Amino acid sequence: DRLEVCREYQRGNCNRGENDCRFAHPADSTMIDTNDNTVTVCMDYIKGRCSREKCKYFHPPAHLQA
């Protein structure tokens, strides 16, 4: 899974906010591919199985997985 990052979020301008927005709002420490502005998803998280203390892969909220 490779999710499109919210360009408005990246420039400090997302008026929808993270909860509503259907694009990714990744943390500054999260792996991002600058070639296409996507974040590769943590597949463990999708299954409720990510127990890593500091995972560097995007954990998509429920409304993005929908």
Ligand SMILES: [Zn+2]
């Ligand atoms: Zn957004």
Ligand SMILES: [Zn+2]
């Ligand atoms: Zn994870």
